[PDB]
Amino acid sequence: METAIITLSKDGRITEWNKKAEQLFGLKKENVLGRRLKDLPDFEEIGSVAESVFENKEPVFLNMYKMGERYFNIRFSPFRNAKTQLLEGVIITIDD
């Protein structure tokens, strides 16, 4: 699988959750949108990694990252608003 994407706001709230993420994690976008990723069971560690990547302003790419019983690559990409340059959130991309 490739391109499961969860995007978080500056405060850690789910602003995107694509079909690959629904497929991968078994939660529907409509049910998780607006919620804190770190509130979701089993997303505590990824939530805390996302918080750290945001605070430090440098991307993290983990390989051989175990979730459930599978290994993943997971990239955390901080991003800024084009106009304001305000650090706006983190895109999390998960691949096999």
Q: Which residues contact 43 (CB under 8 A, 6 or more apart)?
A: 37
Closest alpha carbon to 74 in 34, 20, 13: 20
Residue 65 to residues 11, 41, 74, Cα–Cα distance (Å): 24, 17, 7
Burial per residue of 32-61, b for 16 or more beta-carbon CB atoms within 10 angstroms, e otherwise: beeeebbebeebeebbebbbebbeeeeebe
Rounded Cα distance, 96 and 88, in Å: 27
Question: Å resolution of this model?
Answer: 1.7
Rounded Cα distance, 92 and 77, in Å: 6
Residue 17 to residues 3, 8, 26, 35, 64, Cα–Cα distance (Å): 11, 9, 11, 11, 22
DSSP helix/strand/coil, 63: strand
| Phi, psi dihedral angles at 39 (to 5 degrees) | -75, -15
- Residue ranges and CATH numbers for the domains of the chain are 2-96 (3.30.450.20)
